[PDB]
Paper text:
Olfactomedins (OLFs), modular proteins containing an OLF domain that are predominantly expressed in neural tissues, are involved in fundamental processes of cell growth, cell signaling and cell adhesion. High-resolution crystal structures of the ∼30 kDa five-bladed β-propeller OLF domain are available for four subfamily members: olfactomedin-1, latrophilin, myocilin and gliomedin. While the folds are nearly indistinguishable [Fig. 1(a)], one difference is the presence or absence of a heptacoordinate calcium ion bound in the central internal solvent-filled cavity of the β-propeller [Fig. 1(b)]. To survey the OLF triads for calcium binding and to test whether calcium binding can be reverted by simultaneously altering Asn428 to an acidic Asp or Glu, we replaced the triad Asp–Asn–Asp with Asp–Glu–Ser, Asp–Asp–His and Asp–Glu–Lys via site-directed mutagenesis of Asn428 and Asp478.
For myoc-OLFN428D/D478H, nearly all residues were traced; residues 291–292 in monomer A and residues 292–293 in monomer B could not be traced, although several loops in both molecules were difficult to model, suggesting overall loop flexibility for this variant as well. The far N-terminal region adopts an extended loop conformation, forming crystal contacts [Supplementary Fig. S3(d)] with (i) a side helix of one symmetry-related monomer A, (ii) the outermost strand of blade E in a second symmetry-related monomer A and (iii) two loops (439–446 and 468–475) of a symmetry-related monomer B. For myoc-OLFN428E/D478K the difference upon the addition of calcium is within the error of DSF (±2°C), suggesting that myoc-OLFN428E/D478K cannot bind calcium; for myoc-OLFN428D/D478H a marginal stabilization was observed with calcium, suggesting weak if any calcium binding. For myoc-OLFN428D/D478H, the coordination environment is most consistent with a pentacoordinated metal ion, assigned in our model as Na+; consistent with DSF results, this metal ion does not appear to be a well ordered Ca2+, as poor thermal factors and/or occupancies result when this metal is replaced with Ca2+ (not shown).
Numbering used by the authors: 235 to 290, 293 to 504
Write the structure that this text describes.
Amino acid sequence: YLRSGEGDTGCGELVWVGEPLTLRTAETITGKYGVWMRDPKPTYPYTQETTWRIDTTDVRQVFEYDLISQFMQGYPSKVHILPRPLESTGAVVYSGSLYFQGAESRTVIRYELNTETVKAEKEIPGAGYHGQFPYSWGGYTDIDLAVDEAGLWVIYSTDEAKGAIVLSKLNPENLELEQTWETNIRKQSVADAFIICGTLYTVSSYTSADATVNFAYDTGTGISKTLTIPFKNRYKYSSMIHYNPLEKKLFAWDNLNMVTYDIKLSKM
Ligand code: NA
């Protein structure tokens, strides 16, 4: 009968995903309406409030909005012109830098936003690019950057892995692959992937209404397992999903509107 408070480390396995809630979309009186992103490790001079938006190929513009009020009005505080075209599907902002795959390359670039400067470039060894290793619906999603509680990751595959998902933990400063895992999950058999507390999760489908989170790979054990967590698709097909470890929510983008999925983890 001796009782203790409910202990919690703040991280654990995913046990519940909520139904999608649609966020209010920002105003743009023009066409422009690219994917937007916030920094899970805000770094001065930016804050939790700061937003960035990718323009729309030759994608080379990134809009920066200091205040949510400026974001919601569609009025950037600064427009970044990047030194090389982007792959919009796998870019992320982390610790004050934009990390992105250079168009038609296997190279990840670190672009420091406050100095508008390339600080690191790293070819992902063996990484396929250009529809060599898509997810389950074509396009050019070969290389996918992700941020979780432990920092920056890259999701990809290689000819050596024969299409299996490979993940590498990246040094956020110099982009070295500090650790690599070769999973036994076939990349083209899932629609998308994200990472929470060091576990890789996959989305079964974006075009089925009642989809699931259907695989998990624990990087602490190297073991993959099947899951059946319900995952509701409610819109014009999401085109990408990002976990934000600061907000502890999943953000799904459908090319205009953003929805959020609440989650619950074990105390683990
Ligand atoms: Na993705």
